[PDB]
């Protein structure tokens, strides 16, 4: 009969529906007893991607017309600057929409109500002012380094027995990277095969290619050559050898197909070459080795810089790999993971990417909050009082924000295996008293001292979630429906 | 078949329908509690776009057959000669159409009524030469620099808690700009957080790109090269020509607005030179005024056909993110504003707000005069126009009378977006204007009426001159004609 | 969802429709170019009936289910208290309902909208003192005796080509009638006589009746007898009803002229003139009867014979005979003289007026626009709807004229905002002109009663929240 026509309440509903649909899938994923999800789609999806990381699955795929893709894109900026712990930021933003039902009771102007978000700024600061932080995490630190937040990030994924040990490893990796210039040079891959450790740490960069069956096994005073252009007649062979012998070249890495004639040359010379090396691995390596200029065959000598420690092909345990290590820069390092080997193990690939940005900001912030829901209840006690102080225009919107915090305590306990109702009762009383350390103890079935557990949440996750959620939602709530955008 | 075939009541209606669709959309946008819209299209489009500015969104898409795209097109010329203010002109043109309803009651000849448009020319001249203006503005001005019109554009946006300060900053940018020629060389980008100031002012142009992972970390006494353009052994010659010419200059940086050949990329890193792939053309043109420019041609380009600014080019980090900064411009004509902002998503709306600031201020400095904002101007004129219809003879007057009631809708749109009831607001607004106070207007923050001048909100003189003439001419094309469309197909 | 129940917008519509349905039929009637309609009824009605004036037709029957009958009853009280003029009061009340569509736009409680009516008192004072009024109506009056309201009342009628002259004449009649004594006593009839003057003012009351072929032609020092019940020097006997045959033989020999089935309306006014009668049984002759004795005779005005009563001792009331240029148009003056006189009686008593041709309506409209804005929130929107109602009146006057309505609105407003109360709508001109030159004025009283009458009719919809039923099955 016509084309995309929305009026008063119907348009609001479309924004409203998108937030509720996303929340149900993500809530299971939000804690110690989180759930693993696998998605299967035709064309350029190959098979099933299992993602326990809410951010990764939402950014990758635009399932349908209803708006939510842009909100999802926003979460990624957060990921670079801290990102996770557990994915909770999307859920909290989504629940604000439910209150808009209340807003029709006023029956006047939703934009005016928006002044609540002006006071959201006031509310955002209340979390920052409130809770506390943690006492410890000085820098590096012998044992406060992990068995804390990473374990909680990890707990959602039930690989956490062999895996918590892997989670523990992640901190060591961040300590070397720690400093100005934040996140660079971390690639880490998993290998199929069993070991109790389920992981090895490499001081260098790990690849996975072989020249051929022939060629010297070990290279010394190793020099590295990287060529952008392929090797793909005798004169071409000769140019390469003449430049090569004087240098004493130990390894050649080319990001593409490699022509056969040079291959014979490298073996006799005493030089190990790599065929079709992935470009992304190469770029990281350049920062590591001091870099080099990959022009056509004039590429050797002084146009290139080559680090010279140790390059060798090492059986790590089960599957063969090639190790580049002891780089002069020292800034860039690589992590190698092993596992039980299954859906549960590929989950670790997911978890570590999350692990990688979590501690990246641990270094810069020098601030954190207590975990297990301790942070959320204290703020809720303070925010309830806020609605009364403000003028009535301000009070409705500010009060609505306060009740949102209540759901987080409920989800933590609910996944534990203990009835939610009893849990809510005891929790508020302990926070109201004034103890920041006290929180939800899932293991006990009641409440307990969070600090003894050692569960800590990044301070970084809390500042971005409050401010980002507040105006993101505010733009949509303030605005009464969008038009002349649709495709015909 | 054929084309158009319209006459009688139906013909008037197609024009009538176009005006109503656009007016509601733009209505949300005006004033302090303006509405931001995100646009979804899956017809050769990739993502939802959000445009606060009504003019920008109308320009982007021509959705259907009815006439309206040309009316929309005209508003852009207005933006360069005076800027956006808040979008209001399109709404007034649309309401002209609504009294056509009383026109079917005419039941005789609509064309005689058309005399009103000629009358309108007399009327347009009645406000342009009358109530508006200000006294002062001697060039530069220590305090009269702003705290004015930038604020009204900002007031329409919620961010004016800390943002009114940002607005103050924008005129520093205009004072430096004046000189040599018009508005063009200004670039604005918003950062993601950490400042009370919520902004920083930069010496030169700000860019965000890398050559690749390899290449020197930093350069000094940087020289800038810009190119309009991006047997096997002869390939080597291109490599060599570039190196031979390059070494003598000491070339520290190369900026190219397009794809770049792989061979040169390698060379720049060993030399100590940083190159930029697919640099934005808009960034480049701004950069050219700043560096003294050059003439872009073939590899003959390096030496004195090129002018290089020599202070400092480096990739630097502010607070947390890493950006590349061009600094030390001799010209001073063009500078860049970097907003650190007070970490909020309102900050993400800083880009939205400053862009509006950019067009408004350049015009404000050379127009040398202003009007009172917040709808102060519209209500005053409306009280006066009721009298005007009665002075003219009945054929001319009837069209003139309709034009007068058109101004009435603006008070409602300004207040309605504020969040205070629109009905209540109109009654109190009219009473204060009637008394004789030009300064008095709509105080959206209050929800009632107040003194606009204390706020500092003013409109450029130019916005009022151009819109009054433009509304009348667009309207004339529609009513005088009952059968139209255009030439070419079939 | 079963049977006849209504809420908010749907319930409102039934009230809305009743006002609109009446307006289209009545609008046609207004103006010199007005129209007369014929109607045939379903129960206890013999045939199609045609009524020229709106008040007579509205009154006879309450037909339809929607409410509107109650509104109609009010107009007759207005007619008695002043008269028909040209029907227009009903049209003004109906237009107030149209603004209700934008009423929803205010978006909150329709009942406090009613407080707008409270504001209408402000509007009511506006219709007062900031209008033209008289500034001249001293007594008799050399030029402004007429050429005014009677002419406007007259205009809606077809005959206004020679008739407008007759209408002017009717004020001479009002001046003699003038005073607090018995308003009425004015009767006029047409005569198949000759051209141009089209009417002669004369000596006394005119009546078209005869006793029979046998009876004396003229009586002097006449004695008048009026009896409620059917059948001194007695000269004439006038009875309002059937007269018994036996007395008739007697009257002829005696020298007495009697009138069979004389109209009651002629009789009551005749009584004030003579000095009154106590109309009882045959005991009626002598003192209980008051007679006047100057002269009663049946005379030919210009050709045809009729009976004239004159020389009233009392002097309180007098009558205009008129004459004319042979047609249905001519005896239309019969209806018009009576109409013109009544408006004047109010004019002498009140000693206040205004200017006609819609001059009064446009001036007030310019002033009332200010009032809406001045009043607080809720009061302002309801008050302004009333103000825009006034705008339609200028349009209706012009539309019936056969002249361009759009052009008319602009020029009309143009003359009024200047401050010249004299300028108004001249339909004969086709544009705007000086109303005073025409000489048109409206009585002060007609404007206050119309305002009170229109306001109450509007409230029947609002003072009672609901009237019918909901869902039995």
UniProtKB/Swiss-Prot annotation, chain C:
Its main location: cytoplasm. It is found in: Cytoplasm. ATP binds at residues 31, 85-87, 442, 447. GO terms for cellular component: cell body; chaperonin-containing T-complex; microtubule; zona pellucida receptor complex. Keywords: Acetylation, ATP-binding, Chaperone, Cytoplasm, Hydrolase, Isopeptide bond, Magnesium, Metal-binding, Nucleotide-binding, Phosphoprotein, Ubl conjugation. It catalyses: ATP + H2O = ADP + phosphate + H(+). Belongs to the TCP-1 chaperonin family. This is T-complex protein 1 subunit beta. It comes from Bos taurus.
